[PDB]
């Protein structure tokens, strides 16, 4: 399984990795990705191509090293990165700046397309605060920061469209779109918060948390086809699954990592698969597809074994399309869990998955790429 990833040493730590979005009408595989750096004397955003040199040999091991196409200097650490579209990359900075870069494919260059230099700052001191996470729904951009603020931008608007001041009294670590006008945020006090961006107030619509001791939540992702299903990762390395319609508590809590979980992502086109990365140097693939064997109604077979776990579930919810991630049946939810990287990397800070391709970035100053995720 170690033979699935091409490793590229790049001589700087990688904070973020994202695939360039492909057209849904193209049979084209993603061949271009972007990376952000952190904790370097000069931080940068880089664009990379995976090499396709035409191995018409079904039997040669893939040694296609990623090639840097171009780069641009980034003020402070790249705290988060997303593609807004095929040509535009959005970044959150440790300086509190949100920046849109444009990639010019014709000359392989990056340029600043737009910038908000005071997106994040502490009220009263006007001191800059880190922009910790960003999410894109073209042309809309949302950012969150250590100042506990939520900012809404449009890529063509020079001004911030809306700020939610004092949205949190704590650091927000992650943000995702629940819907076109609803976002989820995660914070340093172990809360998942739902926001309606059209609501004129600064209060969240809903607040979710674990029972008992609360640990920081670092990452959040939303199931692509099932908007009510959310995954989060936190400081204790735990994977939490939520139904944001059903209660304020997680539906499942899974031991995923031995240290801080940095990213969680559902597979965009095959959401029976989920991926997580951690400070412990691991990259996990979670497979929930084992229950997709259509119930072939046949035949009977007895046997008993007891193991105790407490769940109080009332016995009347219709068999509507059980999300594999919400299955509570210990006889049916066989999650297959695979570590994708060899043992002993430094921190795996970021992952992204598109089609058959996965990229991740590490504190080992290395990028890992596979193009045969499920082979």
């Amino acid at each position: 399984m170690a033979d699935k990833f091409a490793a590229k040493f790049v001589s700087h730590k990688i904070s973020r990795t994202r695939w360039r979005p492909v057209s849904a009408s193209s049979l084209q595989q993603p061949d271009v990705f972007a990376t952000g750096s952190w904790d370097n004397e000069e931080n940068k955003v880089c664009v990379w191509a995976t090499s396709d040199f035409g191995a018409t040999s079904l039997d040669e091991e893939y040694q296609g090293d990623p090639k840097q196409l171009c780069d641009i200097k980034h003020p402070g650490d790249v705290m988060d990165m997303q593609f807004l579209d095929k040509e535009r990359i959005v970044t959150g900075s440790s300086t509190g700046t949100v920046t849109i870069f444009r990639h010019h494919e014709n000359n392989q260059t990056l340029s600043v397309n737009q910038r908000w230099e005071q997106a994040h700052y502490h009220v009263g001191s006007n001191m800059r605060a880190p922009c910790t996470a960003i999410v894109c729904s073209s042309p809309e951009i949302v950012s969150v920061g250590e100042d506990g603020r939520i900012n809404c931008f449009r890529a063509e608007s020079r001004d911030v469209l809306r700020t939610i001041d004092d949205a949190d009294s704590s650091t927000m670590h992650g943000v995702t779109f629940l819907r076109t006008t609803e976002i989820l945020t995660v914070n340093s006090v172990g809360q998942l918060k739902l926001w309606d961006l059209r609501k004129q107030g600064n209060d969240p619509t809903q607040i979710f948390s674990v029972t008992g001791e609360r640990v920081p939540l670092h990452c959040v992702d939303r199931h692509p086809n099932q908007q009510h299903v959310v995954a989060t990762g936190g400081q204790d390395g735990m994977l939490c699954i939520w139904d944001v319609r059903h209660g304020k508590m997680p539906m499942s809590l899974l031991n995923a990592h031995e240290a801080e979980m940095w990213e969680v992502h559902f597979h965009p086109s095959n959401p029976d698969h989920l991926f997580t990365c951690s400070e412990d140097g691991s990259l996990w693939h979670w497979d929930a597809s084992a229950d997709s064997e259509k119930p072939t109604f046949l035949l009977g077979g007895r046997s008993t074994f007891n193991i105790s776990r407490s769940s109080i579930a009332p016995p009347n919810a219709n068999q509507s399309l059980a999300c594999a991630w919400l299955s509570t049946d210990p006889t049916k939810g066989q999650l297959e869990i695979t570590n994708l990287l060899p043992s002993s990397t430094l921190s795996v800070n970021s992952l992204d998955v598109l089609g058959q391709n996965l990229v991740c970035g590490t504190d080992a100053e290395a990028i890992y790429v596979t193009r045969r995720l499920f082979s």
Partner: protein
């Protein structure tokens, strides 16, 4: 150590000290800050030129090289792999494993040099810096490979010369370049360097490749063909040692002597007298020192000349004799105005079997402890160091690993590797790790959480407290009170939690609302860290109960916060004002007894205000707003008391 009678290497700093200005300096964790100072104001010039430049002198530029960053990460993986494996293998299996570990280090050096070479061709302005780094890495790999042969493989007489021929071949490539150019010619036998290619292959012990070139000459020259056949036969018959033969060194020496007598007989018979180049090759096969020195330019180095001399005069050389031949080869090869280079001293010390002198010379020549730290660690696993503690309580291995790891801690991305090096330092590693962990620049919460995990795994409770206190203070400076409070609670700093709690109460008095509600609501058992944090959390629980319309429970909690004296005296007005909406409700919420307790708390505060007021501050506008608030409170308390007495009296029938 006698104090080094070596003048300290002067580092000239361009532009510093122009104009009789005094130099100020400040030591950083691995950098020296330098700035110009005017140390003596004799004269009121308000136009004294601002110090326009601050210089940062870095001792280790190599730590910042993107390519050497790969060297440090791959070498760390090899190092940690070696330390974990130290318990598992005995005898011959261990030696083969240590040679494999040595080869893994050399493979990383070679891969870094190949990458630097490809980068140097692409970029003209940085090419010179890559060329100097490639030269240093080549000298490291050269000397490491020699140390692998002499110390780790401990090569005996016989195999030793085979490994030294392979060593020269891996590090001296000029003969192959000459032969490639000769072979690209339309007529290789008419090429000026043709015989240099033949002679160069013979000097390297490459008899088969020399014979392939001679076969071309035998095809072209009908007159030379008889002599080429004799020389081809001499080269073909040359005895070679093989690393798996049943042949004794004595049986080899006898065959080698007989072959040498065959070469000498052909020379004495004048067999080659019509071709000076074939005669020269035959004199090289006899180990003729004059002809070997005439071919200096093909060998380029005294250690290639050494190995050529060993091949043709001393093919059964013992390890104990190598230094004598090395010294003699250096002296003969350098017998003009050329001084030995620092690399020559290193290689001579290696041939002397003086590991301490090899380490010392590399510690002087190298900017970076990488070579000496990893070579010494690998040689310590060979049991070549006696357990002599230096006068400072560490052994030489631990000393070099501590300084190397300290070097890695200076760099913003490599400090994590330095942690694992300190864990394999048994005497001082833990104390060095504590000291360096407290000095890490915490620029981001992500970096602080990584440092905390490392400290928590190693039970470093003081460093965990120090890091959390630093992050709490940084968050406080950034006006993030909730983040500051969370970090103060994690530090278990009750005094700092009190100071942050007083700022939340002050911000509430100024704004009427809390900025970070969700964190205060989730304090749980951490609320008990200080009386002021206890008050803040319970006062927030009151506002939550009030928002949930639980007015009786909220009223009882608010009263308990005043009577328990956990509220700061400055905040008692605000608490009494927050009781006003509950006192004015249509339903009696406060009992007659509870209303008397509230009246007592109001009067206790009015008494305290009369005692704190020295007579001269009665005249600034804040006194009237407070008095109106107190009159409203007295009226609300009297109205609640009158209702409470009527309702309680009506329930006692």
């Amino acid at each position: 150590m006698e104090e080094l009678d070596v003048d300290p290497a002067e580092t000239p700093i361009p532009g510093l000290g122009q104009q009789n200005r005094h130099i100020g300096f400040s030591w950083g964790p691995g950098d020296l800050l330098l700035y110009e100072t005017l140390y003596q104001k004799q004269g009121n010039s308000e136009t004294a030129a601002r110090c326009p430049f601050m210089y940062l002198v870095r001792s280790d530029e190599d730590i910042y090289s993107p390519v050497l960053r790969k060297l440090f990460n791959e070498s760390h993986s090899i190092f940690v792999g070696l330390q974990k494996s130290a318990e598992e293998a005995s005898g011959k299996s261990r030696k083969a494993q240590l040679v494999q570990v040595s080869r893994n280090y050399r493979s990383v050096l070679r891969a870094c040099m190949e990458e630097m070479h490809t980068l140097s061709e692409s970029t003209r302005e940085t090419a010179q810096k890559y060329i100097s780094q490639i030269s240093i890495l080549s000298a490291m790999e050269l000397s490491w490979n020699l140390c692998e042969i002499l110390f780790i493989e401990s090569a005996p007489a016989g195999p030793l010369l085979i490994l030294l021929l392979e060593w020269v071949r891996l590090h001296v490539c000029e003969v192959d370049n000459i032969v490639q150019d000769v072979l690209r010619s339309e007529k290789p036998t008419e090429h000026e360097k043709f015989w240099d290619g033949v002679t160069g292959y013979v000097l390297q012990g490459r008899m088969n490749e020399a014979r392939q070139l001679l076969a071309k000459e035998a095809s072209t020259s009908a007159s030379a063909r008889s002599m080429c056949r004799v020389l081809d036969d001499l080269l073909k018959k040359m005895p070679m040692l093989h690393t798996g033969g049943t042949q004794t060194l004595t049986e080899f020496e006898l065959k080698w002597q007989h072959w040498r007598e065959e070469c000498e007989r052909h020379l004495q018979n004048g067999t080659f007298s019509s071709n000076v180049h074939m005669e020269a090759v035959c004199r090289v096969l006899l180990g003729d020192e004059e002809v070997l020195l005439e071919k200096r330019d093909l060998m380029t180095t005294w250690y290639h000349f050494l190995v050529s001399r060993l091949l043709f005069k001393h093919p059964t050389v013992k390890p104990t004799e190598l230094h004598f031949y090395a010294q003699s080869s250096l002296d003969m090869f350098l017998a003009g105005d050329s001084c030995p280079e620092p690399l020559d001293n290193i290689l001579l010390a290696a041939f002397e079997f003086d590991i301490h002198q090899v380490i010392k010379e590399f510690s002087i020549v190298s900017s970076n402890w990488w070579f000496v730290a990893h070579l010494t660690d690998l040689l310590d696993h060979c049991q070549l160091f006696q357990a002599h503690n230096l006068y400072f309580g560490a052994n030489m291995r631990e000393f070099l690993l501590l300084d190397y790891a300290s070097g890695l801690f200076s760099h913003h991305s490599l400090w994590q590797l330095g942690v694992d090096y300190f864990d394999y330092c048994p005497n001082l590693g833990r104390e060095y790790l504590k000291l360096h962990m407290e000095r890490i620049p915490l620029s981001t919460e992500k970096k602080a959480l990584k440092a905390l995990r490392i400290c928590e795994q190693r039970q470093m409770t003081e460093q965990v407290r120090s890091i959390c206190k630093t992050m709490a203070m940084q968050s406080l400076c950034n006006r993030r009170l909730g983040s500051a409070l969370s970090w103060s609670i994690r530090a278990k700093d009750a005094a700092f939690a009190t100071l942050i709690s007083d700022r939340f109460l002050k911000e509430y008095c100024e704004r009427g609302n809390f900025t970070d509600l969700d964190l205060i609501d989730n304090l749980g058992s951490a609320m008990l860290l200080s009386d002021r944090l206890t008050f803040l959390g319970k006062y927030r629980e009151f506002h939550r109960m009030y928002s949930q319309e639980q007015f009786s429970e909220a009223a009882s909690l608010l009263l308990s916060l005043m009577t328990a004296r956990i509220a700061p005296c400055s905040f008692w007005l605000t608490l009494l004002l927050d009781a006003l909406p509950l006192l004015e409700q249509k339903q009696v919420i406060f009992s007659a007894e509870q209303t008397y307790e509230l009246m007592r708390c109001l009067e206790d505060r009015m008494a305290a205000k009369l005692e704190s007021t020295s007579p001269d501050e009665i005249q600034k506008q804040d006194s009237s707003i407070d008095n109106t608030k107190v009159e409203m409170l007295r009226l609300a308390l009297a109205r609640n008391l009158a209702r409470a007495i009527v309702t309680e009296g009506a329930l006692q029938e």
